[PDB]
Amino acid sequence: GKLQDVVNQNAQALNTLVKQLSSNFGAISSVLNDILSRLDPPEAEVQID
Amino acid sequence: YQPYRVVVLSFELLHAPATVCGPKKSTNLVKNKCVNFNFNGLTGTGVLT
Amino acid sequence: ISNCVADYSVLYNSASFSTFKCYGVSPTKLNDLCFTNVYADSFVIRGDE
Protein backbone atom coordinates (compact mmCIF):
# COMPACT_ATOMS: atom_id res chain seq x y z
CA GLY A 1 0.00 0.00 0.00
CA LYS A 2 2.94 2.36 0.50
CA LEU A 3 3.83 2.06 -3.19
CA GLN A 4 0.18 2.21 -4.32
CA ASP A 5 -0.48 5.56 -2.63
CA VAL A 6 2.17 7.28 -4.76
CA VAL A 7 0.53 6.00 -7.95
CA ASN A 8 -2.94 6.83 -6.61
CA GLN A 9 -1.85 10.44 -5.98
CA ASN A 10 0.02 11.13 -9.23
CA ALA A 11 -2.73 9.65 -11.42
CA GLN A 12 -5.38 11.50 -9.38
CA ALA A 13 -3.63 14.88 -9.40
CA LEU A 14 -3.47 14.55 -13.20
CA ASN A 15 -7.15 13.71 -13.69
CA THR A 16 -8.10 16.79 -11.67
CA LEU A 17 -5.77 18.83 -13.88
CA VAL A 18 -7.18 17.39 -17.12
CA LYS A 19 -10.80 17.72 -15.98
CA GLN A 20 -10.17 21.44 -15.39
CA LEU A 21 -10.01 21.99 -19.17
CA SER A 22 -13.83 21.76 -19.24
CA SER A 23 -14.69 24.67 -16.92
CA ASN A 24 -16.01 28.01 -18.12
CA PHE A 25 -14.13 30.14 -15.54
CA GLY A 26 -16.63 32.89 -16.38
CA ALA A 27 -16.36 32.75 -20.18
CA ILE A 28 -19.06 31.93 -22.73
CA SER A 29 -17.66 28.44 -23.32
CA SER A 30 -14.91 26.19 -21.98
CA VAL A 31 -13.55 25.16 -25.41
CA LEU A 32 -11.30 27.68 -27.12
CA ASN A 33 -12.02 26.68 -30.73
CA ASP A 34 -15.73 27.47 -30.28
CA ILE A 35 -14.99 31.03 -29.12
CA LEU A 36 -12.87 32.12 -32.09
CA SER A 37 -15.53 30.82 -34.50
CA ARG A 38 -18.30 33.14 -33.26
CA LEU A 39 -16.52 36.24 -31.94
CA ASP A 40 -14.52 39.02 -33.57
CA PRO A 41 -10.98 39.81 -32.34
CA PRO A 42 -11.75 43.02 -30.39
CA GLU A 43 -14.35 41.30 -28.17
CA ALA A 44 -12.90 37.77 -28.16
CA GLU A 45 -9.71 38.89 -26.38
CA VAL A 46 -11.72 39.40 -23.18
CA GLN A 47 -13.38 35.96 -23.28
CA ILE A 48 -10.04 34.24 -23.91
CA ASP A 49 -8.32 36.15 -21.09
CA TYR B 1 -41.80 59.01 -30.17
CA GLN B 2 -41.41 57.82 -33.78
CA PRO B 3 -42.42 54.18 -34.40
CA TYR B 4 -39.50 51.81 -34.98
CA ARG B 5 -39.86 48.30 -36.36
CA VAL B 6 -38.10 45.77 -34.13
CA VAL B 7 -37.26 42.09 -34.65
CA VAL B 8 -35.23 39.99 -32.20
CA LEU B 9 -33.40 36.81 -33.25
CA SER B 10 -32.24 34.20 -30.72
CA PHE B 11 -30.10 31.18 -31.65
CA GLU B 12 -30.37 27.81 -29.91
CA LEU B 13 -26.86 26.38 -29.51
CA LEU B 14 -27.96 23.19 -27.74
CA HIS B 15 -26.66 19.69 -28.49
CA ALA B 16 -28.84 18.42 -31.34
CA PRO B 17 -28.68 17.79 -35.09
CA ALA B 18 -28.22 21.08 -36.92
CA THR B 19 -31.13 22.36 -39.02
CA VAL B 20 -30.38 26.04 -39.69
CA CYS B 21 -26.97 26.56 -41.27
CA GLY B 22 -25.10 29.25 -43.16
CA PRO B 23 -24.24 29.45 -46.87
CA LYS B 24 -21.14 27.27 -47.10
CA LYS B 25 -20.05 24.66 -49.63
CA SER B 26 -19.45 21.10 -48.44
CA THR B 27 -16.32 19.33 -49.68
CA ASN B 28 -15.43 15.65 -49.75
CA LEU B 29 -13.10 14.53 -46.97
CA VAL B 30 -9.74 12.77 -46.78
CA LYS B 31 -8.48 10.24 -44.25
CA ASN B 32 -5.27 9.67 -42.28
CA LYS B 33 -4.28 13.33 -42.79
CA CYS B 34 -5.27 15.98 -40.26
CA VAL B 35 -7.43 18.74 -41.74
CA ASN B 36 -9.21 21.85 -40.46
CA PHE B 37 -12.56 20.08 -40.39
CA ASN B 38 -15.77 22.07 -39.90
CA PHE B 39 -18.46 19.47 -39.20
CA ASN B 40 -21.60 21.59 -38.62
CA GLY B 41 -19.30 24.20 -37.07
CA LEU B 42 -17.16 21.82 -34.98
CA THR B 43 -13.85 23.53 -35.66
CA GLY B 44 -10.78 21.43 -34.97
CA THR B 45 -7.69 19.72 -36.33
CA GLY B 46 -6.98 15.99 -36.45
CA VAL B 47 -6.82 12.94 -38.70
CA LEU B 48 -10.07 11.18 -39.60
CA THR B 49 -10.35 7.39 -39.67
CA ILE C 1 -37.40 29.03 -37.81
CA SER C 2 -35.87 25.63 -38.59
CA ASN C 3 -35.21 23.03 -41.31
CA CYS C 4 -33.94 25.71 -43.67
CA VAL C 5 -30.94 27.75 -44.80
CA ALA C 6 -30.50 31.30 -43.51
CA ASP C 7 -28.25 33.97 -45.01
CA TYR C 8 -26.85 36.74 -42.82
CA SER C 9 -24.08 38.14 -45.04
CA VAL C 10 -26.53 40.37 -46.93
CA LEU C 11 -28.72 41.01 -43.87
CA TYR C 12 -26.64 44.05 -42.92
CA ASN C 13 -26.31 44.98 -46.61
CA SER C 14 -30.03 44.50 -47.32
CA ALA C 15 -31.37 47.89 -46.21
CA SER C 16 -30.87 50.63 -43.61
CA PHE C 17 -31.31 49.50 -39.99
CA SER C 18 -31.07 52.01 -37.15
CA THR C 19 -29.79 49.44 -34.63
CA PHE C 20 -28.06 46.15 -35.52
CA LYS C 21 -26.62 44.83 -32.25
CA CYS C 22 -25.59 41.23 -31.56
CA TYR C 23 -24.87 39.64 -28.17
CA GLY C 24 -22.49 36.69 -28.01
CA VAL C 25 -22.09 36.24 -31.78
CA SER C 26 -20.19 38.50 -34.17
CA PRO C 27 -22.46 39.41 -37.12
CA THR C 28 -19.63 38.99 -39.64
CA LYS C 29 -19.05 35.36 -38.58
CA LEU C 30 -22.73 34.37 -38.87
CA ASN C 31 -22.08 32.92 -42.34
CA ASP C 32 -20.38 29.72 -41.12
CA LEU C 33 -22.41 28.69 -38.05
CA CYS C 34 -25.08 26.03 -37.55
CA PHE C 35 -27.93 26.36 -35.06
CA THR C 36 -30.43 23.77 -33.87
CA ASN C 37 -33.34 26.25 -33.86
CA VAL C 38 -33.77 29.98 -34.47
CA TYR C 39 -36.51 32.16 -32.99
CA ALA C 40 -37.89 35.50 -34.19
CA ASP C 41 -39.98 37.98 -32.20
CA SER C 42 -41.68 40.96 -33.85
CA PHE C 43 -43.32 44.08 -32.41
CA VAL C 44 -43.23 47.88 -32.69
CA ILE C 45 -41.53 50.12 -30.12
CA ARG C 46 -40.59 53.81 -30.19
CA GLY C 47 -37.03 54.78 -30.99
CA ASP C 48 -35.99 56.05 -27.56
CA GLU C 49 -37.03 52.70 -26.06
Side-chain angles (χ1 to χ4, degrees):
Chain A
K2 292 195 103 54
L3 290 163
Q4 198 70 38
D5 293 1
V6 178
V7 179
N8 283 349
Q9 293 194 50
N10 293 154
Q12 170 193 121
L14 281 152
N15 293 343
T16 308
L17 171 56
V18 166
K19 287 177 181 175
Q20 279 280 112
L21 276 173
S22 80
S23 49
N24 314 77
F25 283 117
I28 50 160
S29 161
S30 66
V31 55
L32 192 145
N33 301 325
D34 292 16
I35 318 162
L36 277 296
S37 172
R38 44 181 271 211
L39 279 180
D40 273 329
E43 87 278 358
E45 294 179 352
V46 64
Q47 293 297 302
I48 290 179
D49 222 335
Chain B
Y1 275 113
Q2 296 319 299
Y4 282 62
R5 198 72 148 261
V6 173
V7 54
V8 171
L9 306 178
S10 178
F11 308 119
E12 277 196 354
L13 301 153
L14 292 173
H15 323 312
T19 52
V20 192
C21 286
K24 284 312 171 143
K25 182 143 153 60
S26 69
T27 72
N28 47 0
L29 61 86
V30 298
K31 293 189 179 181
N32 309 70
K33 285 145 195 65
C34 52
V35 180
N36 307 112
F37 47 82
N38 203 287
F39 299 101
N40 300 354
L42 194 146
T43 300
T45 309
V47 303
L48 315 175
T49 63
Chain C
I1 303 170
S2 50
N3 68 276
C4 62
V5 169
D7 186 282
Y8 318 87
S9 54
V10 301
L11 201 72
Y12 168 64
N13 298 346
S14 50
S16 63
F17 302 111
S18 59
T19 292
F20 194 10
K21 195 170 196 304
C22 317
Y23 307 81
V25 188
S26 80
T28 312
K29 282 185 173 178
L30 273 167
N31 294 319
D32 52 359
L33 307 185
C34 282
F35 320 107
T36 76
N37 264 197
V38 187
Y39 295 93
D41 308 273
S42 55
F43 41 82
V44 286
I45 292 177
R46 64 191 286 266
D48 201 10
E49 294 280 334

